[PDB]
């Protein structure tokens, strides 16, 4: 069944492109043998650069589950997750990920997937989008608030 679900993700990626929804990426999230949510890249039609197929599928699955974690779920994606989506997977915590195409296939199609992976390893200020650290005396204050917030929900 892993192949079946991955084939569905690839079909969704093609359909997304051909219907003008977005980019060539699709994803499916499964739990207990049932698809709980699907996603297609929809960045340009939703004015949301975070609306990658995997992110969209994660958001929709979490809404169906009424949860912020993907306990016992498997994510199937048409292409290896980019850094944003790999991060989203680690915050959502499904049990496994299956993918077909690789980041190099996305890069060959003109996308920044590979470039972003490489930017992570560059020194912060030399990144194409520079990242500057600034010292603030109260930079740990949010963490102190968190420690003292009795009704917190960990994530």
Q: Which residues bind Zn ion (CB under 5 A)?
A: 52, 82, 84-85
Is 54 tagged catalytic?
yes
Q: At what angle do helices 53-65 and 2-18 cross, to 10 degrees?
A: 120
Q: Which x/- pattern, by CB under 8 A, does the window 29-58 give for a second copy?
A: --------------xx-xxxxx-x--x--x
Determine, following the binding rule CB under 8 A, whether residue 72 of this chain makes contact with a second copy: no
Determine, following the binding rule CB under 8 A, whether residue 21 of this chain makes contact with a second copy: no
Rounded Cα distance, 77 and 84, in Å: 14
Question: Which residue, 42, 39, 1, is CA-closest to 22?
Answer: 42
Question: From the candidates 3, 15, 54, 126, which is the catalytic residue?
Answer: 54
Binding residue per annotation — 82?
A: yes
Determine, following the binding rule CB under 8 A, whether residue 87 of this chain makes contact with a second copy: yes
Question: Which residue, 44, 46, 63, 155, is CA-closest to 29?
Answer: 63
Given a contact cutoff of 8 angstroms between Cβ atoms, the answer to whether 34 and 18 are in contact is no
Given a contact cutoff of 8 angstroms between Cβ atoms, the answer to whether 29 and 70 are in contact is yes
Determine, following the binding rule CB under 8 A, whether residue 104 of this chain makes contact with a second copy: no
Q: From the list Zn ion, a second copy, none, which binds 154 (C-beta under 5 to 8 Å, kind-based)?
A: a second copy
Instruction: Give the nearest distance from C-beta 33 to Zn ion in angstroms.
Output: 25
Binding residue per annotation — 52?
A: yes
From first CA to last CA, the distance across the chain in angstroms is 30
Dihedral sign, CA of 125, 54, 74, 9?
negative
Binding residue per annotation — 2?
A: no
Binders of a second copy among residues 105 to 134 (CB under 8 A) are 105-106, 108-110, 112, 115-117, 119-120, 124, 129-134
Q: From the list Zn ion, a second copy, none, which binds 65 (C-beta under 5 to 8 Å, kind-based)?
A: a second copy
- DSSP states of 64-81 as a string? HHTSSS-TT-EEEEEE--
Give the active site residues. 54
Q: Which residues contribute to the annotated binding site?
A: 52, 82, 85
């Amino acid at each position: 069944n892993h192949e079946t679900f991955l084939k569905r993700a690839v079909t969704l990626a093609c359909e997304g492109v051909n219907a003008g929804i977005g980019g060539p990426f699709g994803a499916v999230i499964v739990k207990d043998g049932a698809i709980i949510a699907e996603g297609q890249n929809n960045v340009t039609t939703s004015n949301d650069p975070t609306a990658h197929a995997e992110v969209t599928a994660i958001r929709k699955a979490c809404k169906v589950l009424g949860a912020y974690q993907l306990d016992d779920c498997i994510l199937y994606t048409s292409c290896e997750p980019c850094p944003m989506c790999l991060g989203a997977i680690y915050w959502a915590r499904p049990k496994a990920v299956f993918y077909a195409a690789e980041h190099t296939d996305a890069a060959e199609a003109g996308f920044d997937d590979s470039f972003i992976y490489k930017e992570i390893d560059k020194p912060a200020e030399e990144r194409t989008i520079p990242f500057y650290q600034v010292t603030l005396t109260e930079h740990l204050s949010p963490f102190q608030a968190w420690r003292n917030f009795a009704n917190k929900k960990e994530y």
